[PDB]
Motif scaffolding. Structure first.
Motif, PDB file in Angstrom:
ATOM      1  N   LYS A   6      32.238  26.805  23.166  1.00 40.20           N
ATOM      2  CA  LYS A   6      31.462  25.465  22.561  1.00 40.20           C
ATOM      3  C   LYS A   6      31.936  24.788  21.490  1.00 40.20           C
TER       4      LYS A   6
ATOM      5  N   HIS B 216      27.497  26.800  16.120  1.00 39.56           N
ATOM      6  CA  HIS B 216      28.470  27.710  17.035  1.00 39.56           C
ATOM      7  C   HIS B 216      29.490  28.122  16.288  1.00 39.56           C
ATOM      8  N   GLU B 217      30.151  29.221  16.658  1.00 36.96           N
ATOM      9  CA  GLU B 217      31.327  29.642  15.826  1.00 36.96           C
ATOM     10  C   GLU B 217      32.584  28.783  16.503  1.00 36.96           C
TER      11      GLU B 217
ATOM     12  N   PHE C 264      29.729  26.450  31.266  1.00 33.09           N
ATOM     13  CA  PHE C 264      29.180  26.269  32.369  1.00 33.09           C
ATOM     14  C   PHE C 264      29.496  25.153  33.316  1.00 33.09           C
TER      15      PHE C 264
ATOM     16  N   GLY D 132      34.238  32.011  20.999  1.00 27.57           N
ATOM     17  CA  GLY D 132      33.908  32.203  19.739  1.00 27.57           C
ATOM     18  C   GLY D 132      35.034  31.864  18.520  1.00 27.57           C
TER      19      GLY D 132
ATOM     20  N   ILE E 155      29.164  36.331  26.502  1.00 27.87           N
ATOM     21  CA  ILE E 155      28.010  35.172  26.166  1.00 27.87           C
ATOM     22  C   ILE E 155      26.906  35.830  26.546  1.00 27.87           C
TER      23      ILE E 155
HETATM   24  C1  NSC Z   1      25.079  31.232  15.501  1.00 29.29           C
HETATM   25  C2  NSC Z   1      25.811  31.757  16.837  1.00 29.29           C
HETATM   26  C3  NSC Z   1      25.634  33.107  17.414  1.00 29.29           C
HETATM   27  C4  NSC Z   1      26.282  33.357  18.446  1.00 29.29           C
HETATM   28  N1  NSC Z   1      26.123  34.793  18.910  1.00 29.29           N
HETATM   29  C5  NSC Z   1      27.246  32.771  19.047  1.00 29.29           C
HETATM   30  C6  NSC Z   1      28.200  33.014  20.047  1.00 29.29           C
HETATM   31  C7  NSC Z   1      29.335  32.326  20.505  1.00 29.29           C
HETATM   32  N2  NSC Z   1      30.221  32.725  21.373  1.00 29.29           N
HETATM   33  C8  NSC Z   1      29.788  31.999  22.620  1.00 29.29           C
HETATM   34  O1  NSC Z   1      30.270  32.073  23.898  1.00 29.29           O
HETATM   35  N3  NSC Z   1      28.691  30.901  22.942  1.00 29.29           N
HETATM   36  C9  NSC Z   1      28.210  30.188  23.730  1.00 29.29           C
HETATM   37  C10 NSC Z   1      27.242  30.143  23.491  1.00 29.29           C
HETATM   38  C11 NSC Z   1      26.198  29.610  24.466  1.00 29.29           C
HETATM   39  C12 NSC Z   1      26.606  28.409  25.313  1.00 29.29           C
HETATM   40  N4  NSC Z   1      26.270  27.680  26.128  1.00 29.29           N
HETATM   41  C13 NSC Z   1      26.729  26.746  27.092  1.00 29.29           C
HETATM   42  C14 NSC Z   1      25.756  26.085  27.846  1.00 29.29           C
HETATM   43  C15 NSC Z   1      28.170  26.948  26.990  1.00 29.29           C
HETATM   44  C16 NSC Z   1      28.909  27.683  26.406  1.00 29.29           C
HETATM   45  N5  NSC Z   1      30.437  27.531  26.283  1.00 29.29           N
HETATM   46  C17 NSC Z   1      28.298  28.356  25.285  1.00 29.29           C
HETATM   47  C18 NSC Z   1      28.927  29.652  24.377  1.00 29.29           C
HETATM   48  C19 NSC Z   1      29.577  31.048  19.681  1.00 29.29           C
HETATM   49  C20 NSC Z   1      28.697  30.816  18.832  1.00 29.29           C
HETATM   50  C21 NSC Z   1      27.632  31.511  18.284  1.00 29.29           C
HETATM   51  N6  NSC Z   1      26.864  30.916  17.124  1.00 29.29           N
END
Ligand code: NSC
Length: 257
Positions: free
Chosen positions: A100, A105-106, A128, A78, A142
């Motif tokens: 991501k 997303h952040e 993933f 994030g 996550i």
């Molecule tokens: C609005 C919002 C809310 C959160 N809790 C977030 C968390 C994150 N941190 C993560 O790790 N997010 C995340 C979240 C979901 C994901 N899904 C896949 C299939 C692959 C990823 N690399 C992935 C990452 C990032 C953006 C967010 N945005």
């Protein structure tokens, strides 16, 4: 079933907005983010943690539950709160964060807190499908909450399946979004058999989440620890409301290493 955690989730889903807002903070610990948030609003790049996550991980590290060292990989980094906290630790030599990003997303937040020059945060990465890499510390925070515990069950198992290929003779700290569903419990027992560690509740977690963290150091009974959290969170529904304990946020310093 049904588990204590599922009973907690039912009651959580029954609360009104005001009851929910009171309950979620009742008796918890939280860092004061006001100053840090104003700093980020101004574009300041020293001292501030980019999220409440830095203090959250610090709680584990100060109890040696995970001890970041060497090459640290941060899956789903994030903004980067976990990565920038680890960058300041003497035993850490490299931090690679993957996340991501994109709409909804952040994105990684560029900072010059202490050790920033050993941090590389990469957006546009779906962990993933990311081939596992050698690392000395594996972090993953996550797990998207849902009012449906069954949805959360699938999301949690998918996270555990994704992180496991990264685990081998290394430190780790992995969020378990929903640890109380029976299928998750069974996966965690097999994971603990293969990789050790223990499930721990972070006191900076709000009462509105049952999240626990699988950390590498030590051992214990997973079912007993989950049930302990469930009873605590259930009792806090009828406990007289208690204002949260407010602590100072972390100061991540400044400069290169
Ligand atoms: C609005 C919002 C809310 C959160 N809790 C977030 C968390 C994150 N941190 C993560 O790790 N997010 C995340 C979240 C979901 C994901 N899904 C896949 C299939 C692959 C990823 N690399 C992935 C990452 C990032 C953006 C967010 N945005």
């Amino acid at each position: 079933g049904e588990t204590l955690g599922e009973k907690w989730k039912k009651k959580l889903n029954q609360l009104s907005r005001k009851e929910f807002d009171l309950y979620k903070k009742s008796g918890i610990t939280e860092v004061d983010r006001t100053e840090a948030k104003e700093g980020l609003k101004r574009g300041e790049t020293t001292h501030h943690a980019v999220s409440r996550g830095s203090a959250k991980l610090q709680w584990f590290v100060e109890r040696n539950m995970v001890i970041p060292e060497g090459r640290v990989i941060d899956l789903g980094c994030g903004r980067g709160g976990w990565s920038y906290y680890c960058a300041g630790l003497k035993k850490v030599t490299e931090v690679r964060g993957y996340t991501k990003g994109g709409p909804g997303h952040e994105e990684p937040v560029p900072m010059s807190t202490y050790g920033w020059n050993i941090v590389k945060l990469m957006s546009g990465k779906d962990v993933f499908y990311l081939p596992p890499e050698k690392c000395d510390t594996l972090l993953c925070d996550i797990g998207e909450s849902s009012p449906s515990p069954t949805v959360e069950e699938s999301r949690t198992i998918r996270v555990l399946k994704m992180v496991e290929p990264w685990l081998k003779n290394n430190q780790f700290c992995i969020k378990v979004l929903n640890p109380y569903m029976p299928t998750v419990i069974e996966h965690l027992e097999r994971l603990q058999r293969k990789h050790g560690g223990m499930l721990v509740r972070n006191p900076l977690s709000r009462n509105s989440t049952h999240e626990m963290y699988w950390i590498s150091n030590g051992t214990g009974n997973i079912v007993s620890s989950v049930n302990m959290v469930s009873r605590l969170l259930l009792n806090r529904f009828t406990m007289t409301h208690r204002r949260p304990t407010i602590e100072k946020d972390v100061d991540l310093g400044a400069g290169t290493r």
